[PDB]
């Protein structure tokens with residue numbers, strides 16, 4: 001029953017016109033259901049036959065619901081959709097369960113045969129003209145046009161949510177207590193009434209909707225909703241099944257990482273560093289890619305986590321929002337968002353994408369930021385952070401760091417591993433210390449280079465290098481220097497590159513050299529670096 | 536009656552997405568818009584409107600009243616022909632010469648003149664919801680909106696009249712109108728100036744609720760910023776290196792700056808802390824260069840067809856150096872900025888002010904806001920910029936990554 005609601009004026013893109021696509025004559029067994037169904041839809045008013053001369057047409061097809069016997073009509077509107085103007089994107093972005101305020105009772109209502117019960121702007125009805133064939137190419141006369149929002153049309157979702165929002169308003173007024181959240185075709189109604197008081201309102205709405213032409217049904221809490229197994233006071237992700245295979249393709253490792261990520265928002269410790277490091281190469285789907293010892297050990301560690309089930313609690317706008325961060329492996333972090341000790345609202349992880357020689361003080365900051373955005377999206381406020389780092393440690397780095405930054409409120413939480421500043425450079429040369437004038441270079445052609453130094457004390461060295469870049473050498477120079485030096489050194493390099501990599505004070509970039517230089521700076525008591533115009 | 540507004544052909548309206556807001560800000564935007572709706576300044580709209588422009592909530596200067604701030608940067612670009620050519624607003628190349636320039640907020644004027652019914656659809660904006668639980672309230676403007684350059688453009692006429700009776704009385708005060716602000720300049724004495732502004736404020740208010748407010752600037756102090764060399768008593772090998780370091784860098788800007796004269800004091804692998812004697816036979820270069828660095832280079836003309844670029848460097852200790860330019864190493868201006876170390880002030884709050892500072896100096900000097908190369912993280916800025924923001928306009932920005940000696944230079 002088409003609703004009495006107002007229609008939304010629609011138009012076709014600036015200089016276009018409606019679909020003239022001609023109907024492909026086919027099976028008369030199909031042309032059997034097309035008339036059978038159009039007939040019923042014509043009665044219900046969803047459609048109407050129109051004057052012979054409607055210059056447009058959209059192909060009609062016919063698909064049988066194998067299991068039922070009842071055919072279903074299908075209209076491939078894709079050509080019209082190309083000619084139909086743009087609408088306010090059916091606001092995508094599905095609410096995160098961790099942000100919904102807990103309720104005593106929550107019911108869902110399937111507003112399925114809904115959009116078909118909504119009038120379509122008059123003047124735009126013609127462009128929705130289709131044509132049911134005949135016994136045989138002679139009687140084309142069977143021509144209709146929709147009077148409601150045609151499934152698959154472009155502006156259907158938009159004009160429906162809209163129409164629905166308007167329809168619910170008169171009801172939400174009479175019922176300020178409850179809250180309704182529409183989504184695609186499933187209504188959510190929650191309240192703090194009483195199980196039976198709540199049962200009276202739900203049936204009230206149904207009648208209200210019905211008085212608007214929209215029809216509803218006469219599951220339970222453990223809901224189906226988009227990857228979320230829902231409950232009477234908790235939420236989680238639909239059960240997961242991580243594949244066991246002897247061979248893996250790009251297309252398999254992708255579905256694995258995806259599945260594993262989806263788990264993150266509730267399963268603490270989930271990792272993907274190695275499993276996704278595999279896809280580094282070109283996206284050549286179904287390319288059997290060999291596993292790895294790390295990647296295999298990793299997939300395992302996740303399996304042991306996924307073992308037991310993990311549940312999530314809802315939102316209580318009454319308490320605070322706390323977030324805590326734990327540094328796991330090198331380059332990976334995890335955090336939990338909660339309002340009550342050990343019983344999370346939601347969880348997740350962070351990782352240094354490029355990783356180009358970074359800092360744990362900096363990554364921890366990237367995480368706090370990453371969590372702040374997320375919190376705002378879900379809760380409309382930021383959380384109070386609990387962090388494995390010493391205020392003094394942080395200040396030291398932020399006050400001396402070139403980029404501006406700023407972390408919300410955060411208290412210290414002495415919980416190893418703590419956050420690192422393993423070594424600091426000397427702001428001023430070191431008196432009485434040997435000075436090395438390191439440097440090196442390679443041949444962009446031969447792939448061969450030399451890395452050495454010349455000390456003020458007359459000592460000098462020069463080591464041969466193969467398969468090296470002019471940046472690998474410049475760091476090999478600095479390395480040599482630290483090796484052939486006392487506990488205090490003064491190094492002078494020609495490479496801004498190397499200078500800066502060290503000034504950023506990275507860590508275990510699993511770049512053996514850069515990790516070796518780092519281990520050396522830690523051992524020294526005082527190191528002073530300095531740069532001088534190359535050559 | 537409407538003043539036909541067209542988008543630069545081959546261009547469609549704005550479709551920018553709304554940034555997520557704190558529940559606090561959502562709340563303020565809701566009250567404000569509900570009032571604006573009552574007063575007919577805006578109206579609700581349906582899905583038949585694919586357009587959208589961002590909205591923030593800021594605190595006006597000195598009040599605890601929330602202010603709506605629609606980010607029209609995109610619609611401004613998509614209507615540039617309208618407000619830059621068809622209705623341009625010539626900029627007084629002498630407003631920078633006055634001794635004191637006050638800034639007045641006249642944006643409240645625009646809410647008078649109604650907007651071209653056919654253009655309205657392009658001002659669509661969305662008050663968001665938390666966690667997506669709801670669709671989003673959608674409005675479009677019915678009157679000229681603030682932040683949209685087309686607004687002062689259309690209103691000039693009505694402005695030019697209301698201001699006539701004042702420009703005649705004090706033929707020496709300069710008045711420039713940019714966006715929703717008036718930049719009044721004068722060579723009077725602080726005491727009188729504040730008086731002439733209050734005169735103007737009351738004038739404006741008599742001729743129709745054109746109610747303004749107050750910001751003290753002083754162009755005549757906005758002098759150069761020549762780089763400085765650090766002359767000492769003694770000089771180590773190191774100091775000379777760093778000195779040669781900055782000098783060999785200055786040579787991308789200044790011509791007569793040569794250093795091969797000082798490079799002969801680091802001759803052959805010498806200790807770092809080893810004090811080096813001061814050779815006079817060289818000082819005819821240091822001394823010669825210490826001067827070349829006080830008075831600017833030839834050329835450097837403001838190209839009006841080009842864009843203004845503002846880079847800022849964190850100098851630490853609540854200090855920030857900056858430079859505006861159009862083509863690398865030909866700065867049209869360079870300054871500094873200092874915070875006020877207590878009860879607040881973090882990097883972010885500072886940067887935000889330094890940006891607002893530089894932008895106003897820009898409007899006043901070139902009638903044009905620049906594009907900033909902000910040394911900060913895109914997401915961090917996107918998170919807090921809106922906290923210490925007072926301006927009613929928003930510049931264009933982008934985020935950079937690590938200045939080699941560009942910071943150690945302007946120190």
Ligand SMILES: Cc1nc2cnccc2n1-c1ccc(Cn2c(=O)sc3ccccc32)cc1
Pocket residue numbers: 095097100101102103104105106108181182183186187188190221223225230231232233234314668
């Ligand atoms: C918040 C709450 N407390 C509950 C208590 N008992 C049972 C279910 C409960 N829920 C609950 C159940 C399901 C859903 C998911 N959900 C739907 O399906 S429809 C819909 C629209 C908007 C947002 C979410 C949503 C969201 C919350």
